Amino acid sequence: IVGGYTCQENSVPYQVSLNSGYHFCGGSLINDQWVVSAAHCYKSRIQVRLGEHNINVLEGNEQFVNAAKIIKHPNFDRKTLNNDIMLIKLSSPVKLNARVATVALPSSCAPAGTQCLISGWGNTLSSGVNEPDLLQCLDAPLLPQADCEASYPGKITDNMVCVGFLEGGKDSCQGDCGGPVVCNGELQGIVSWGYGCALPDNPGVYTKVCNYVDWIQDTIAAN
């Protein structure tokens, strides 16, 4: 998260860190045994880290659970990032509490101008890399589809939405991939891609979760 603020400890209880020896992506807990992330975050084994604030210090509220099934959307395209969405079924259900909680799926697609919360332990710099120890948050609004298309001609499909600021300075970045964009209590976006990080005229692009509520429910049901 570039240009954000440190989240209060455990105030974004659905945020998880995907770890394979180091933090590499975010995700969001949607039920006691499943997390939603981005397909670009796929790995053969993943440990899901819930209840975290400092990812390098054990502060007392972590729950670490291995991923049992890792399911990328069947039409994910690694080159255009269309359908960048993946579900992770945990090897056991987590203990839900005030610091480890679910976030709701969208009941409708959100309109341009809705204010949202984006979070993660991704790079916090617009040039080079800095990996933060503490979870970072960013308040940012969904942008009109026409601004998103004009910023990345021919690359935005109907399963993508831009969120952020055309002036640059505040954005998500690598390592926040797969994490949440929550608006008014529902998960509307998943960190996906962007040109650079926090650059003017290059807002963050996110998977539009309101297009996959059926796929999510169905998958959960079959697995």
**Of 52 and 176, which CB lies nearer to Ca ion in the complex structure?**
52
Q: Contact region for Ca ion (CB under 5 A) — 46-54, 142-150, 152-160, 175-183?
A: 46-54
Q: What b/e readout covers 10-33, taking b as 16+ CB neighbours within 10 angstroms? A: bebbbbbbbbeeebbbbbbbbbeb
Stretch of 23-31, 51-59, 90-98, 205-213 lying at the interface with Ca ion (CB under 5 A): 51-59
Pairing state between β 160-163 and 34-37:
unpaired
Residue 54, interface with Ca ion (CB under 5 A)? yes
Give the interface size with Ca ion as a residue count (CB under 5 A).
Answer: 3
Instruction: Give the Cβ contact number of residue 98 at 10 Å.
Output: 10
Shortest Cβ distance from residue 55 to Ca ion (Å)?
Answer: 6
Q: Say if residues 210 and 39 touch (Cβ distance below 8 Å).
A: no
- HSE-CB at 77 with a 13 A cutoff on CA atoms is 9
3-state secondary structure of 88: strand
Cβ 59 to Ca ion, closest distance in Å? 5
Closest CB to Ca ion among residues 59, 167: 59
- Interaction between residue 52 and Ca ion (CB under 5 A): yes
| Residue 19 binds Ca ion, judged by CB under 5 A | no
CB of 17 to Ca ion, least distance (A): 9
User: What sign does the CA torsion over 194, 198, 199, 204 have?
Assistant: positive
For binding to Ca ion (CB under 5 A), which residues are involved? 52, 54, 59
